[PDB]
Amino acid sequence: LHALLRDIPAPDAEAMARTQQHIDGLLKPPGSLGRLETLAVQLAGMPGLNGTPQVGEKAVLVMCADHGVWDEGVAVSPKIVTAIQAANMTRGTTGVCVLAAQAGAKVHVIDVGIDAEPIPGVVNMRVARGCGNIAVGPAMSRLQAEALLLEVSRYTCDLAQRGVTLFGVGELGMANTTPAAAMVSVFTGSDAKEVVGIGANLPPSRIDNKVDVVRRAIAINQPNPRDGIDVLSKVGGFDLVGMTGVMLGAARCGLPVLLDGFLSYSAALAACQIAPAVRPYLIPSHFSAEKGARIALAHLSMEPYLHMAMRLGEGSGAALAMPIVEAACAMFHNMGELAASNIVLP
Amino acid sequence: LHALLRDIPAPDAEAMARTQQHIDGLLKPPGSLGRLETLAVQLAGMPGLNGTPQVGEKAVLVMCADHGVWDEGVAVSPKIVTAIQAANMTRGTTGVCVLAAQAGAKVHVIDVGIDAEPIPGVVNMRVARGCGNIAVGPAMSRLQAEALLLEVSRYTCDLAQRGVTLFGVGELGMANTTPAAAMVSVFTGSDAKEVVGIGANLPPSRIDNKVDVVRRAIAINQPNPRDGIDVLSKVGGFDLVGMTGVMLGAARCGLPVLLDGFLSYSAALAACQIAPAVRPYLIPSHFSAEKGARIALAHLSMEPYLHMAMRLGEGSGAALAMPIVEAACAMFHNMGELAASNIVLP
Ligand SMILES: O=C(O)c1cccnc1
Numbered sequence: 246l247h248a249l250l251r252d253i254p255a256p257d258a259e260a261m262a263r264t265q266q267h268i269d270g271l272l273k274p275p276g277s278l279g280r281l282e283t284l285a286v287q288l289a290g291m292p293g294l295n296g297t298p299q300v301g302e303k304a305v306l307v308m309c310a311d312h313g314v315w316d317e318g319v320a321v322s323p324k325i326v327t328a329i330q331a332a333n334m335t336r337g338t339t340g341v342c343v344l345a346a347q348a349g350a351k352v353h354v355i356d357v358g359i360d361a362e363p364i365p366g367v368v369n370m371r372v373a374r375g376c377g378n379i380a381v382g383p384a385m386s387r388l389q390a391e392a393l394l395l396e397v398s399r400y401t402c403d404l405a406q407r408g409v410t411l412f413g414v415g416e417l418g419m420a421n422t423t424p425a426a427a428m429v430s431v432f433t434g435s436d437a438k439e440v441v442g443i444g445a446n447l448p449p450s451r452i453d454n455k456v457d458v459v460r461r462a463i464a465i466n467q468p469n470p471r472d473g474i475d476v477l478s479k480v481g482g483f484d485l486v487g488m489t490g491v492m493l494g495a496a497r498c499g500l501p502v503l504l505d506g507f508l509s510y511s512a513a514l515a516a517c518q519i520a521p522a523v524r525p526y527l528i529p530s531h532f533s534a535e536k537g538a539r540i541a542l543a544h545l546s547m548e549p550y551l552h553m554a555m556r557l558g559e560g561s562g563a564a565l566a567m568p569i570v571e572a573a574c575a576m577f578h579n580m581g582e583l584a585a586s587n588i589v590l591p
Numbered sequence: 592l593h594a595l596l597r598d599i600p601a602p603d604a605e606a607m608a609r610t611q612q613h614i615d616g617l618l619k620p621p622g623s624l625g626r627l628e629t630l631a632v633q634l635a636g637m638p639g640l641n642g643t644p645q646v647g648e649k650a651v652l653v654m655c656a657d658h659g660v661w662d663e664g665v666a667v668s669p670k671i672v673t674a675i676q677a678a679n680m681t682r683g684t685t686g687v688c689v690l691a692a693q694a695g696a697k698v699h700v701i702d703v704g705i706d707a708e709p710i711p712g713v714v715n716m717r718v719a720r721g722c723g724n725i726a727v728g729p730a731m732s733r734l735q736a737e738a739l740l741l742e743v744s745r746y747t748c749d750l751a752q753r754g755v756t757l758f759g760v761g762e763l764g765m766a767n768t769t770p771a772a773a774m775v776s777v778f779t780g781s782d783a784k785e786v787v788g789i790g791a792n793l794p795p796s797r798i799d800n801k802v803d804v805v806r807r808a809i810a811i812n813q814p815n816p817r818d819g820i821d822v823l824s825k826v827g828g829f830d831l832v833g834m835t836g837v838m839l840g841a842a843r844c845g846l847p848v849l850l851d852g853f854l855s856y857s858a859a860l861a862a863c864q865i866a867p868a869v870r871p872y873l874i875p876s877h878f879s880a881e882k883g884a885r886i887a888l889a890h891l892s893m894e895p896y897l898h899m900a901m902r903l904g905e906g907s908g909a910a911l912a913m914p915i916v917e918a919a920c921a922m923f924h925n926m927g928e929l930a931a932s933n934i935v936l937p
């Protein structure tokens with residue numbers, strides 16, 4: 246693990262300078278394609294990409310797990326929905342499934358801690374049958390967190406060996422917006438009231454209780470904001486841990502990862518805390534409708550491309566942004582050049 | 592023309608109610624897919640769509656024309672770029688071409704007033720060799736404007752007869768951000784300083800002159816803000832007119848149109864002024880980097896989906912948003928149902 250973190254490659258400034266120059270020569274006013282240009286250059290700096298903006302195979306990794314905090318009445322969805330939906334993920338009927346198919350991406354469902362019998366067809370990396378209730382103690386042990394990070398990290402880099410060049414991260418876990426909010430509060434230094442949202446249609450009344458639960462989790466566990474693993478293990482969850490693991494894995498592999506929504510932002514804060522070298526590999530997708538999204542994004546210094554008021558999760562926003570990534574590549578490789586048309590701009 | 596405007600269909604409230612209900616039953620918390628849901632319902636109300644969110648063939652119509660106002664020093668691109676780029680549109684090397692191909696859309700290049708010899712391969716609907724210089728008089732005659740509207744309108748609806756279900760609008764015309772700004776100022780009641788941008792890399796110094804040119808255009812022509820055709824003919828251009836015509840055509844045909852950037856917003860204001868019935872058929876794509884974009888969008892009451900800081904034009908933003916439209920359709924048709932999984936949410 247220390248190794249892993251040690252070996253995360255820096256971005257290739259040389260490939261990036263070459264990309265920039267190429268882009269500037271394209272058939273358009275310089276910088277006119279804005280964020281599409283910046284993205285392309287960003288991709289070019291990624292070592293696993295072979296010095297150019299490219300997209301080969303695509304995969305969305307969905308981390309599923311249950312949370313003990315569900316018992317605190319912080320979620321209106323029945324707990325069993327985690328297991329049901331995970332199964333549905335196998336049949337291609339879920340939101341992420343439909344969107345991924347549209348993007349030509351494959352979905353990998355990973356069980357990191359569902360509180361139910363094993364689901365056939367789902368990748369088994371189960372830590373336990375749901376994590377501890379963060380309101381009265383830690384979600385899991387440091388060991389458990391570190392092990393899972395390692396395991397998902399490897400699984401991720403391994404997919405690279407098989408042609409995957411672009412990853413997307415997602416989750417599934419009833420009540421997971423609670424630990425997500427706690428992490429955000431901790432890493433950001435924001436008060437819980439500011440970052441706690443309605444999650445999956447939590448009624449406005451019930452909010453207060455959610456905020457109190459978050460506060461309790463923090464007071465009780467005293468996670469250290471300077472230690473991302475500390476935070477994850479104390480006030481996070483298996484699903485959140487697995488997401489951070491995908492990010493660590495892609496980075497080590499020198500490949501890009503598309504974030505999803507709120508849950509993903511929380512995992513991204515932790516990953517960046519654990520290894521700042523991770524940052525350049527992350528790509529935002531959309532702007533989550535969750536209340537604490539703006540704050541989380543600000544701390545990551547990211548501006549998402551899509552404003553869809555989405556708040557489903559599962560990696561649906563990541564899938565939806567994949568075509569954008571491919572567009573930056575198409576632009577880069579298929580557009581004609583100014584010089585060739587004899588166009589000279591001041 | 593009065594006919595045409597007369598026959599624009601209202602949206603189908605019945606299909607819309609049916610869509611909403613179907614969406615609510617999908618495998619996700621209600622309203623969790625946000626804007627993707629709203630879009631789907633919007634499409635379902637479009638009569639040319641057959642009561643459901645569907646996307647058959649896609650087309651981007653690019654209206655090319657030159658402007659006499661170029662002589663006022665309001666643009667740094669050589670005038671000839673309009674003709675060059677129009678030709679390039681035929682070879683598939685431009686920005687819109689590359690993006691449309693990625694979206695599986697076909698690009699139709701239409702010459703409505705390029706100041707050069709006819710370009711083989713380009714649809715010929717040329718009004719004149721560039722429009723009049725709005726700084727000292729009107730861009731064209733009311734007759735000319737009305738005729739072009741009619742002609743493009745028909746061309747548009749005709750494509751429908753051949754399987755096109757989704758249109759995208761674009762333009763190409765050196766100096767066109769000047770008339771675009773004038774229209775925006777007029778329709779919005781905003782002062783020119785607020786809506787005049789740098790267009791295609793106009794140097795900061797040169798701005799002042801651009802603002803003065805806009806003001807002059809307005810003082811001199813006295814366009815009537817309550818008459819969209821009046822405004823288009825006086826302080827618009829052929830390209831702008833053609834774009835409005837596509838919008839009128841799609842609406843009459845009861846089909847959706849994806850807007851592009853700043854130039855497109857200006858055309859949309861005019862179309863809406865001419866026929867409010869047009870509004871429900873319009874779909875924003877991205878948030879143009881042009882200074883006056885926020886104001887124009889506010890008046891159209893639209894919030895774009897994409898924030899890419901783009902400012903190329905040609906219909907590139909429209910092409911980039913097409914996958915989003917298809918996503919709303921995929922969601923609608925391919926997702927599983929709550930009831931089927933025995934999921935009950937309060
Ligand atoms: O932003 C998300 O991904 C999200 C928000 C609420 C509930 N589930 C997921």
Ligand SMILES: O=C(O)c1cccnc1
Binds near residue numbers: 902
């Ligand atoms: O927003 C646009 O479409 C645009 C802005 C500047 C120059 N050309 C096009």
